Amino acid sequence: TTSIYPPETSWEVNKGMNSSRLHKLYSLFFDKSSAFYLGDDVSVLEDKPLTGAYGFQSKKNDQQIFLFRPDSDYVAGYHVDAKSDAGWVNDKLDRRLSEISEFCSKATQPATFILPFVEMPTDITKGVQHQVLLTISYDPKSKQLTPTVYDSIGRDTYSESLSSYFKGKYRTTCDEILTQSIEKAIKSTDFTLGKFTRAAYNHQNGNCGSYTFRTIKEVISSSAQGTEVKIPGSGYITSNSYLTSQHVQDIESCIKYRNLGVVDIESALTEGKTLPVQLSEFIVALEDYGKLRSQQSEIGYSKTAKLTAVELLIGILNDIKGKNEISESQYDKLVKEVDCLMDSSLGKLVQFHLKNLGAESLQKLVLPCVKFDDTID
Amino acid sequence: TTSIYPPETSWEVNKGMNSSRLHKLYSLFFDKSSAFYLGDDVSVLEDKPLTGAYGFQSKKNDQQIFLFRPDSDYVAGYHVDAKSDAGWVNDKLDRRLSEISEFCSKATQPATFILPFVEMPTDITKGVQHQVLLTISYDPKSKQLTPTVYDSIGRDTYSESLSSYFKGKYRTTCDEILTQSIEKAIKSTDFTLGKFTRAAYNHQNGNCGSYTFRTIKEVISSSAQGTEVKIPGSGYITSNSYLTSQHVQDIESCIKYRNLGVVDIESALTEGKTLPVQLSEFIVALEDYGKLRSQQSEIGYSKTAKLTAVELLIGILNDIKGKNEISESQYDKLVKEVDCLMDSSLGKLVQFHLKNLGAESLQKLVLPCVKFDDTID
Ligand SMILES: [Ba+2]
Ligand SMILES: [Ba+2]
Ligand SMILES: [Ba+2]
Ligand SMILES: [Ba+2]
């Protein structure tokens, strides 16, 4: 168990997802600068905790929404070979299903449970893991609950499609073992099991993670009321309108440039709070850029140039955090390095932080806190 | 512990290396069709086993060569931040170093120990692991032994180079902790420690694995006698001449198309044997192609077309293995699918296997074993 979610500079959406990153992204849900912001609901009065998840009262409804914090251990393996057994669900995931069942056994209000999880083939050697989303909606008056999976990799086109017969020899997904796990989680045969369905969308053939996150937003908002809206018809025209570029830079800037504790997040979705960006984060980001840039592995600006720049910027940033102040000479030295710190990736980092610090530039940011006298060097 | 090394179709060199694959590649060392073939030496008379490694008497020398079977656990982590401590070496790797030291404490003949291992930064979040190679050469009359590391990622160019000063703030490699582990492995202060050196070659910035394998070959052959020959001067002109395309298709075809037990390998380097390709392998390869092709994830031929083809080919291949025979009708059905089974990747697979089965084509391969009568459908 590790408790911080560092800035991963040089991370991009095509570089794939994991439980920690996804959880970090959760912080966006209450940030109004963000297109993932839910002003569609509020938190659940401090009761009914349902461990592992964050609760939400609908502002527009009597409907309650429980979104699970992601887990390295929510995983479903499936056997692609169909002579083999359908698969396994990880005993924690199974556990959470049993727990939903038990939350619903006593529930006076309609609920929706949103669990993100990883779906993988275990026969083959690739072991592509794709980020994927389960939601279970329960109605008390209807005495029943309906499973659904939202799958981003839902490409396949007729040429690459599978015949009814060959489907018999080959599993492309974990639906068999998963439905099994669910009808196992409820049996007093207490509940009617609504039909299991799977929502696929356009042509992915590892961006799955980010679509999953977007879908969580869509799934929550759409539950204040309204049908579920995803790409391939019954929704958005294109994948690009659905997950917009403003959704993307939001996600990327979050992962790429921020340093967030898990406590900070937990508080943030418990109290319906936004997490503003501390200056300490700017410093950590710079440091990580710094470490990564110095690497050799997987009047233009050089490595030692970039590094001296980061060193100096870091220094100044600290002396600002230090009570204290900046000195004239230091301001000059920064000015010489400004055009370098605004260059490329490092620039994007810096612009992110200046934007969220309420400063137009490095000079503007740094200009107060400077002590002057007379003529200085 | 898993004991087979399946064919990974769709694997390519740019897709990176691991302990099992690398070990599988070891099988090429005695195959004369292969450019990795050592007709430069023979095995060690069955004595002096030095557990974990394979021994070799030099045909041209009194020199002994011990190449280690790779391990998921031979790993060196290093801290890129230099205010931090240099790193860690995995207690197994350390263990093997202590064991070399002890083999050399009693040794009457000059030896060279070749250990492949993975080198990684632990501060940063990427955790790029790059396949890398240690060799330790001991002389009894010189009372001493010399460490060397061969590093393929040895790119960096002056712009992306690191100043003497910034080297002080940043580690790009595991040399510090590694040299430490070595001078720790010998202290009675019994041995003189030859100077630790590191051989880098051209411009990689994850092919590292395959270069490492090539280097093992170079390191072994070059030890029958001769200086060590790698790319950046003191060797081959270009990386492409060093690791030739004939080296590459050898490696790829090995990983991609073969099914090899670890027992088969162990025997093969113990007895100096070649492993010819069983027909069973062809069948396994086809099956794996089959599984992977049916997947949706990370008059032209369709998925269901390709699959029916594989199904039929597999069927026929089995009936061949089954004592038994093929039937006329079956031969026809194959003929209809021939142009499909020769297409693209599947084709490359099939051509690999036909080449190593002593058959010009599918029809030629399958043509005996067919029973005829009169006019058949
Ligand atoms: Ba289970
Ligand atoms: Ba039923
Ligand atoms: Ba150790
Ligand atoms: Ba010394």
Q: DSSP letter at B72?
A: T
Contact in structure between B166 and A294 (CB atoms under 8 Å)? yes
Question: Which stretch of DSSP H or E encloses residue B89?
Answer: strand B87-89
Q: Please check whether residue B376 lies inside any domain of the structure.
A: no
Q: For the beta carbon of residue A233, count every other beta carbon within 10 angstroms.
A: 8
HSE, side-chain direction, 13 A CA sphere, residue B184: 14
Phi-psi region at A116: left, alpha or beta (left = phi > 0; alpha = psi -120 to 50): beta
Q: Does a structural domain hold residue A296?
A: yes
Q: Cα(B80)–Cα(B123) distance, rounded to whole angstroms?
A: 6
Q: What is the per-residue DSSP string for B226-246?
A: S----SSSSS-SSHHHHS-HH
Helix (H) or strand (E) holding A283: helix A279-293
The whole-angstrom separation of Cα A282 and Cα A301 is 21
CB atoms within 10 A of CB B322: 8
- Per the DSSP assignment, residues forming a β-bridge with A113 are A66, A136
Structural domain count of chain B: 2
**φ, ψ of residue B188 in degrees (nearest 5):** -105, 5
Beta bridge partners of A221: none
Residues of B in Cβ contact (< 8 Å) with A162:
294, 303-304, 307
Q: Which residues pair with B135 in a beta bridge?
A: B114, B148
Q: Which candidate from A128, A170, A206 shows the least CB-CB separation from B294?
A: A170
Residue A377 lies in a domain: no
Shortest CA gap B66–chain A (Å): 29
Whether the Cβ atoms of residue B132 and residue B212 lie closer than 8 Å to each other: yes
Burial of A330 (0-12, 13-18, 19+ CB in 10 A): middle
Residue A41: φ, ψ to 5°: -170, 175
Helix (H, G, I), strand (E, B) or coil at B336: helix
Q: Are A191 and A80 in contact (CB under 8 A)?
A: no
Same domain, A181 and A215: yes
For every residue of B275-310, which 3-state class applies, written as one string? CCCCHHHHHHHHHHHHHHHCCCCCCCCCHHHHHHHH
- Return the biggest CA–CA distance within chain A: 87
Give CA–CA dist B188/B191, Å, rounded: 8
Q: What is the distance between the alpha carbons of residues A25 and A255, in angstroms, rounded to a whole number?
A: 7
- Of B148, B167, B49, residue with least CA distance to B99: B49
Q: Are strands B144-151 and B197-200 parallel, antiparallel or unpaired?
A: parallel
CA-nearest of B260, B268, B348 to B6 is B260
CA nearest to B271, candidates B261, B260, B263, B280: B263
CB-nearest to A123 from B153, B172, B291 is B291
Task: Tell me, yes or no, whether B377 lies in a domain.
Answer: no
| One-letter amino acid of B231 | I
Element (H, E) at A280: helix A279-293
Contact assignment for B125 to A205 by CB distance below 8 Å? no
DSSP string, B129-173: -EEEEEEEEEETTTTEEEEEEEETT----GGG---HHHHTTB--S
> Based on the domain organization, do B81 and B116 belong to the same domain?
yes
Indicate which residues of B carry an active-site annotation.
130, 151, 208
The experimental resolution of this structure, in angstroms, equals 2.8
The residue with tokens 């929706």 is A112
Angle at A345 between CA A339 and CA A351, to 5 degrees: 65
Angstrom distance (rounded) from CA A296 to CA A246: 32
Last residue within a domain, chosen from A214, A245, A270 = A270
Burial (CB < 10 A; 0-12, 13-18, 19+), residue B238, is exposed
Same domain, B233 and B366: no
Q: Facing residues of B133 across strands? A: B116, B150
Q: How far apart are CA A213 and CA A217, in angstroms?
A: 7
Chain mean position to CA A339: 33
Question: Residue B341: inside a domain, yes or no?
Answer: yes
Spatial separation of the C-alpha atoms in residues A7 and B125, rounded to whole Å: 9
Residue A168: Cβ-neighbour burial (10 angstroms; 0-12, 13-18, 19+): exposed
Going by their DSSP bridges, the two strands A370-371 and A260-261 should be labelled as: unpaired
CA dihedral A240, A71, A146, A200 (to 10 degrees): 30
Long-range contacts (CB closer than 8 Å, 24 or more residues apart) made by A310-315: A310/A286, A310/A341, A310/A346, A311/B169, A312/A337, A313/A286, A313/A337, A313/A341, A313/A350, A313/A362, A314/A283, A314/A286, A314/A287, A314/A290
Residue B288 inside a domain? The answer is yes
- Does the distance separating the beta carbons of A163 and B296 come in below 8 Å? no
- A331: containing domain: 279-371
Same domain? For B29 and B163 the reply is yes
Return the closest-CA partner of residue B152 out of B242, B251, B269, B73: B242
**Residue A236 in domain:** yes
Q: Which two tokens stand for residue B249?
A: 């298709």
B374 in the Ramachandran plot: left (φ > 0), alpha (ψ -120 to 50) or beta? left
CA B147 vs. chain centroid, Å, equals 22
Co-location of A263 and A284 in the same domain: no
Q: With an 8 Å Cβ cutoff, are A80 and B295 in contact?
A: yes
Q: How was this structure determined?
A: X-ray
Element (H, E) at A284: helix A279-293
CA distance A33 to B79: 37
> Is residue B165 packed enough to be buried (19+ CB in 10 Å), middle (13-18) or exposed (0-12)?
exposed
Q: B137-150 burial, b if ≥16 CB within 10 A, otherwise e?
A: bbbeeeeebbbbbb
Q: Is the dihedral of CA A107, A112, A115, A119 positive or negative?
A: positive
Q: Collapse the DSSP code of A2 into the 3-class scheme (helix H, G, I; strand E, B; otherwise coil) and give the result.
A: coil
State which amino acid sits at residue A87.
Answer: G
Domain boundary, last residue among B213, B246, B270? B270
Q: Is there a contact between B57 and B64 (Cβ–Cβ < 8 Å)?
A: yes
The strand pairing partners of A103, in sequence order, are none
SS3 content of chain A, % helix, strand, coil (to 5): 40, 20, 40
Under DSSP, is residue B177 helix (H, G, I), strand (E, B) or coil? helix
Q: Is the domain of B231 the same as that of B331? A: no
Interchain contact, B292 vs A161, CB within 8 Å: no
Find the DSSP H helices in A106-205.
Answer: 164-167, 175-185
Same domain? For B118 and B158 the reply is yes
End-to-end CA distance of chain A: 50
Q: How far apart are CA A69 and CA A266, in angstroms?
A: 9
Among residues A4, A106, A116, which one has the least CA distance to residue A54?
A116
**Per-residue CA distances from A188 to A94, A97, A137, A176 (Å):** 16, 14, 19, 21
A169 neighbourhood in chain B, CB within 8 Å: 294, 307, 311
Strand partners, A41: A58
Which amino acid belongs to residue B117? Answer: F
Nearest to B330 by CA among B343, B314, B341: B314
- Do B224 and B185 share a domain, yes or no? yes
Q: Residues of chain A whose C-beta is under 8 A from some C-beta in B?
A: 6, 8, 10-11, 80-81, 121, 123-126, 128, 130, 153-156, 158-163, 166, 169-170, 172, 204-206, 288, 291-292, 294-298, 300, 302-304, 307-308, 311
Q: How far apart are the CA of B193 and the centre of ligand 4, in A?
A: 7
Report the residue of B125, B159, B198 to disrupt the A interface, i.e. the one with the largest count of A CBs within 10 Å. Answer: B125
- Measured between its terminal Cα atoms, the distance across chain B in Å is 50
Find, among B197, B201, B190, the residue nearest to B155 by Cα: B201
* Beta strands in chain A, from DSSP E residues, in sequence order: 4-5, 41-43, 53-58, 64-68, 75-78, 87-89, 111-121, 130-139, 144-151, 192-193, 197-200, 260-261, 326-327, 370-371
Beta-carbon neighbour count of residue A50 at 10 Å?
A: 18
Cross-chain CB nearest to A295 (options B80, B294, B307): B80
Q: Domain check: are B266 and B338 in the same one? A: no
Q: Which chain A residues have a beta carbon less than 8 Å from that of B10?
A: 126
Q: What's the number of CA atoms in the CB half-sphere (13 Å) around residue B307?
A: 20
Query: Which residues pair with residue A55 across a beta bridge?
Result: A66
Number of cross-chain residue pairs from A and B with Cβ atoms under 8 Å apart: 122
Give the Cα separation of B124 and A289 in Å (integer): 10
- What's the gap in Å between B95 CA and the centre of ligand 3? 9
CA A358 to chain centre: 25
Domain annotation covers residue B84: yes
Q: Which amino acid is at B62?
A: D
Backbone phi and psi for residue A116, each to the nearest 5 degrees, phi listed first: -80, 140
Q: Which ligand is nearest to the CA of A90?
A: 1
Query: Which residues are paired to A119 by β-bridges?
Result: A76, A130
Q: Is A71 a catalytic residue?
A: no
A122, exposed or middle or buried, with CB in 10 Å at 0-12, 13-18, 19+? middle
One domain, residues A258 and A341: no
Spatial CA neighbour of A31 closest among A277, A198, A248, A201 = A277
Q: Which residue among A124, A294, A297 places its CB closest to the CB of B130?
A: A297
Q: Please enumerate in sequence order all residues whose Cβ is within 8 A of that of B95, keeping only pairs 6 or more positions apart, or say none.
A: none
Nearest CA of chain B to the CA of A162: how many Å?
6
**How distant, in Å, are the alpha carbons of B324, B326, B376 from that of B367?**
14, 9, 15
Residue B275 to residue B265: CA distance in whole angstroms: 8
Instruction: Identify residue A273 by its one-letter amino acid code.
Output: K
Burial class (CB in 10 A: 0-12, 13-18, 19+), B157: exposed
Q: Which residues are B192's β-sheet partners?
A: B144
Residues from chain B contacting residue A8 (CB–CB below 8 Å):
125-126
- Most A CBs within 10 Å, among B24, B156, B294, to test the A interface: B294
* Claim to verify: residue A109 and residue A88 sit in the same structural domain: yes
> Where chain A is broken, by preceding residue (C–N > 2.5 Å)?
205, 298
Q: Are A103 and A50 in contact (CB under 8 A)?
A: yes
Q: A124–B288: do the CB atoms touch at under 8 Å?
A: yes
How buried is B194 (Cβ within 10 angstroms: 0-12 exposed, 13-18 middle, 19+ buried)?
Answer: middle
Do A209 and A83 fall within a single domain?
yes
Q: What are the tokens at A246?
A: 């403003």
Distance CA A341, CA A324 (A): 23
Helical ranges in chain B per DSSP H: 19-25, 91-105, 164-167, 175-185, 208-224, 239-242, 245-257, 262-270, 279-293, 303-321, 328-341, 344-357, 362-366
Asked if residue B221 lies in contact with residue B38, where contact means CB atoms within 8 angstroms, the answer is: yes
Separation CA B42–CA B225 (nearest Å): 15
Tell which of A241, A270, A299 closes a domain.
A270
- Residue type at A233? G
Q: Residue-wise over A271-308: b if at least 16 C-beta within 10 A, else e?
A: eeeebebbeebbbbbbbbbbbbbbbbbeeeebbbbbbb
Nearest CA to CA, how far is A203 from chain B (Å)?
A: 10
DSSP assignment string, A234-265: SS-SSHHHHS-HHHHHHHHHHHHH--EEHHHH
A99 CA to centre of ligand 2 in angstroms:
21
Residue B148's beta-bridge partner residues?
B135, B197
b vs e for A197-231, b when ≥16 Cβ sit within 10 Å of the residue's Cβ? eebbbbebebbbbbbbbbbbbbbbbbbbeeebebb
Please give the helix or strand (H or E) that residue B260 lies within, else none.
strand B260-261
